[model samples]
Target: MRVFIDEIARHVDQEVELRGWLYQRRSKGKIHFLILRDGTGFLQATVVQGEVPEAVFREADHLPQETALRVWGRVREDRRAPGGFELAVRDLQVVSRPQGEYPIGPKEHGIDFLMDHRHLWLRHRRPFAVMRIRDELERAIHEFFGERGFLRFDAPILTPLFEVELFDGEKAYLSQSGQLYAEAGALAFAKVYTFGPTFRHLLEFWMVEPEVAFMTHEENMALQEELVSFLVARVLERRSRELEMLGRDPKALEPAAEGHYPRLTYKEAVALVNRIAQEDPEVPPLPYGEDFGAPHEAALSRRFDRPVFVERYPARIKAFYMEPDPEDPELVLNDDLLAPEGYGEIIGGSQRIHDLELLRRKIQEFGLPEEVYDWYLDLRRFGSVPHSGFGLGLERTVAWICGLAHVREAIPFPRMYTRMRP
Candidate 1:
């Protein structure tokens, strides 16, 4: 029967078949071992002199790295094996053979070299683990919202960056943010989420944006706490090996999983940043009302054991859509969720302005054309209840979870300004 490497435990001692690539290979006088990676995971196929025909043993020994093949085997319990089990091969079939030496070797290669060969580099251990963690986090977003009764409402990829005129007449531009459409869905469905690409604003970047109607800023923060906590806990639970492979300590994420991420007002965050910057030369001195850069966000995150939210930013610094704080009109009811260990802000959220006239005033104040916001104002025209939402950047979150210094490895193929190819 065909089986995946991860399913080996249940099929112990049973004859089965595995189709995959030869990740690595080695041979002794009488035996050969093939480290096979079949997408699900890696496994060791042990071939002894007498276990299989001489021809099959020779064939296994000669199979080059990444050569496609199929192997029939008996799943045997072996504590010494990587996954506590090994495949005792009975026969083999060659599918296809790779030509020439594999470009990536078991030695060090810099980021540029690795990225250049990303098409083949993904089979390596580090990227493999990072991708596994990325996969878990991506699915966790859908699972988290799905369980909470939120409909998965995917917004359009081709969105109007601004409703504008062009030489070819009106045209939809590549998405900059999905949060706006998510708000439209929020009013219609009460609770809705969109998990897809929006730029950081990149040519492409994944975002999990959720909008909820009648939710206060405090309630929005509470929802964020729960979602972030659930995602971190889920990754810790399921991707322990992946974390271990990436040399990331589970303790680094434990506090975030607890859901007590510290919250600070923008003023408090500025004070904290400046205070921390006094001692740490790495963190920069901040001027008031400016957005936090990576170093500034890192200063605050370093203060806490987990993710931290900096709220009540100055209204002028935020988009016109965010609601102004009732207590202080100069500040907006929003927060930027900064991840610990210098991964930077993973989420930006706000309680949206639901009052039509107030939104128009803010739009005018920002100097945005009223015609451009007419459709957005329509949400307020009809039963515009107070709504809140946030956009979580997938690559940044993956970088934090995987302990990657850069987001390039978080996605299968990074489309950076410098390079955009396989």
Candidate 2:
């Protein structure tokens, strides 16, 4: 099928056959003008009375918005065509005709109704723009990784329930992070990453992580600096038109600040939080030995216009697999990269604990069954090197990258807290 919208501008003043839906249409006396949508975009298709067959005029006259149609027309340049070119229809065909109660029409709609009919809702303005940005961001991610020597590693989604330690098989969650799988692969390749869906059944969220081995804590920070900066730059450069279409401020996103992408220790972050909340008791107080809350992450991100990574989290709050601080064993070598514009933590990564005996001891200390992770232990039991990687929520990351106000529009079929269907 020839997608109608793509057949524009270049085909002006030439014969073109198109298939699409009447996104919108209007009639003035005997003349009819319509905007057709073919998923790619919307274009103007015009039909004039007396110039075209009577049947085509009648069909175009009664054509409701969203009704599917196939049109054979000669494209022409006209300043009023919305797309700079208008179609003069010579023939028309109704394909998959739509009936009354077209869920989406030219009118106001509530968020509930839109969510309920998300399939149709995606064609709307804001959602369509957000989805386009999502595509560009995904492409940019691949570009960033491939340019580097990061080898892609596929991780298993389903695993034995025992992998979650004592959690019952029924209660055990889906793979929250690809850290374990990617880490093992990184040991062999010495530089590896995983880019795929990570289900967190417990948290009911998804994440994406890039696990790199043979990388030190400082090296990991440098890698993150390059990766995030590259991704954001690519988004701004490649998605310039889309960004302007969505009203995103391109100037707001620039290269990182003068120094390194500001890295704050857990102590420094907590101190800053406490200092800010001293006057307002109601403000969130930084709880020692815990992860930063959404608000805290936002505050940390705003410290710089570009992406920022708050590093060296409390050891107790961080995963036992994260390497301990060399100077102060009380903190773990971990960092959370917060996207700019109030987007919360988009990345959580750390220099993995590589010592075999120490890893085994940490697992045993936490009462996690060692037998369950025999394969993981085997990596350390043999020869293990320094490994570090971070997982990013693809939707959340893309949402920020595209400057989207809401994340739902980034995913094709967004599965949020409240599902639209049973």
Candidate 3:
């Protein structure tokens, strides 16, 4: 019977036929070891010269890497095998052979060369592991939001340009964030979220923006903390195999996944950055009203054992929609969740301003066009209640979870600042 590599465990001691490509091969005198991959998983097939027909053994021994073939073998449990099962082959047939050598080899490759051949490079183990983690993370996100009784509100791709820098004569630009549309949905649904692609100036990316009505700043932070905790836990529970393949240390992630995240004010994080700057000249002391740079974010993340929430940022540095703190008008009720181990700023969220006059004044002060945001302003004009939401950068979160140095590897087709081809 035809079977996949992942299903081999159930067919142990039973003969099966597997159609796959030769990932690698080795020969010892009369026995040939062929490593095969069929997209689902990899399997090690051993062919003995004496047990198999001489013709089959000879064909297996001469097979090249990535050669398409069909093998009839009996699955056996072996602790040393890749998936704890090996295929003892009795017959082999080559379906196709590569006309030339594969560009990517079993060795270290330069980033340029690897990315240039990204289409073929994805067949490698590292890309496969990262893609699997991305899949699990996306599934967990949907499940988490669904279980909370939040309605999935699909946001539009083509929206009026919000940024002053990108607002040319064009009336419509790609959507940068779905928070505005989500706010409208939340008023009707009580709780709503939009999970879709949002475009920016240079590149487009996926975002999960959830908005809840009648929620205070405190409740917003609490919800964010719980959402993050749940995502990490789900990834750890369901994607252990992929995590193992990526060489991620589970102990390093356990604290963030299973424990409570720390919360600190933006001022407190600034103090911490100043303290570290004294020791490391590479890091400069952060000013009170200035936004945290990547270095400043990394410094704060290093001080915490888990993901840390830096809240109550300066009002001027935040968007016009963020609500000002009642205690301090100069600071906004906002937070940026810095991922542990130097993965900076995975989430940015805050309670939005519900007062029509305050929002109008802020929009004028920021020099944003009144005509473009008239629809957004209408949300406040009619039955506006306190609402809060945040956007989670999907690629950044996945990169952090997989311990990837760059976000490019987390996405299948990455559009970098310069490179845009497949």
Candidate 4:
């Protein structure tokens, strides 16, 4: 029977067929070893001169990297082999051969070269491991929400916006944030989440926004913590091997996965950031009522052992939709969660203003087109209850969890303003 390399453990001592490309190859005087990747996992196949036909054994040595082939082999338990299982090849068949030498050979490739060759770079070990973690994170997000009875309400990709970026002189354009439409969903479903591509300031990216009716700002925070904790724990449990392959220490993520992320008032965070700037002149000073820049966030992230939440930012700095703090009229009931090890903020959320008149006033105050936001304002008019939600960047989350240096590696095909192609 055909079997994946990852499932070879269950098919021990049984002959199976594995179809994949040759990831790497090595040869001894009488024996040849081929590292075959079948998408599920990598397996080391050993073809011996006496055990297999001479022609088959010789064929393995000449196969180029990423050559598509099929191998019939008996699975055997081997502690030293990749995935803790080795394939004893009985025969091999070449499905295809490359026309020329593969460009990405076993060498230290520069970032530009790697990015340019991304089409073939996914076969490399690091990218393979990173992609696996990305997949695990996506699965965990769905499971976390599904187990909590959150309905998936995907918002339309084409949407009305107040910004000229997507306006295009058109009535509606690409949606920047589905928060307003998601609010409508929350009103109907009580608990609703949107998992789709968002044209958030990133130009193009994926965000998961969950809106809950009658949920306080505190409840919104608790939900973010729970979701993050679940995502980290699930990824660690299912993809420890992949993390190890990526050189990410599991202990680095333990504190975050354990729960109870430290919460700091925006005022307190400002003080801490200023203190950091005092000690290191390189860190830019973060003044009151200003959003934290990447340098400021990096400084703060290094001090925390796990993800940390900084709350109650000034109203003038935050989006107009955020509910103003009852005690501090100048502050909004919003929070930004920063990941540890200088990864910076992965989530930004708030308690949306549900009062109809207040929302309308804020929308007008922000100079948003009244007609553009009329539909959004409608949610507050009919049976509105206190609602809260936040948008979490998937690529940012993956980069933090996987300990990647670049966000580009966290995604399969990264789209940036400067570059976007295979």
Q: Residue pairs in steric clash, candidate 4?
A: none
Point to the candidate with the largest TM-score. 4
| Whole-model lDDT per candidate | 0.87, 0.75, 0.87, 0.88
Off by over 4 Å in 4: 161-171, 200-202
**Model 3 off-target regions past 4 Å?**
161-171
Instruction: Report the C-alpha lDDT of model 4 over 16-104, residue by residue, as the tens digit.
Output: 99999898899887879888999888889999988888889778878998899999989999888877889999989999998898888
> Compared with the true structure, what per-residue lDDT tens digits does model 2 show for residues 41-141?
67778889999989989988887767788899888888876767878888899887676668777668876678688888878656766777777767777
Mind sharing the TM-score for model 4? 0.96
Candidate 1 pairs with clashing backbones: 199-202
Q: Estimate each model's TM-score.
A: 0.95, 0.88, 0.94, 0.96
Q: Cα deviation of 403 in candidate 3 (Å)? A: 0.9
**TM-score comparison, 2 vs 3, better candidate:** 3
In order of listing, the candidates' clash counts read 1, 4, 0, 0
What is the overall TM-score of model 2 with all chains considered together? 0.88
| Candidate 4: residue 223 Cα off by (Å) | 0.5
Scanning candidate 4 in windows of ten residues, the lowest lDDT window is 160-169
Error of 2 at 39 (Å): 1.1
- What is candidate 4's CA lDDT for residue 345? 87
Q: Cα miss at 422, model 4 (Å)?
A: 2.3
Of the two candidates 3 and 4, the one with more favorable lDDT, higher being better, is 4
Question: What lDDT tens digits, residue by residue, belong to model 1 across residues 373-420?
Answer: 799999999999999999888888898988887887789988877777
lDDT, candidate 1, residue 88? Answer: 95
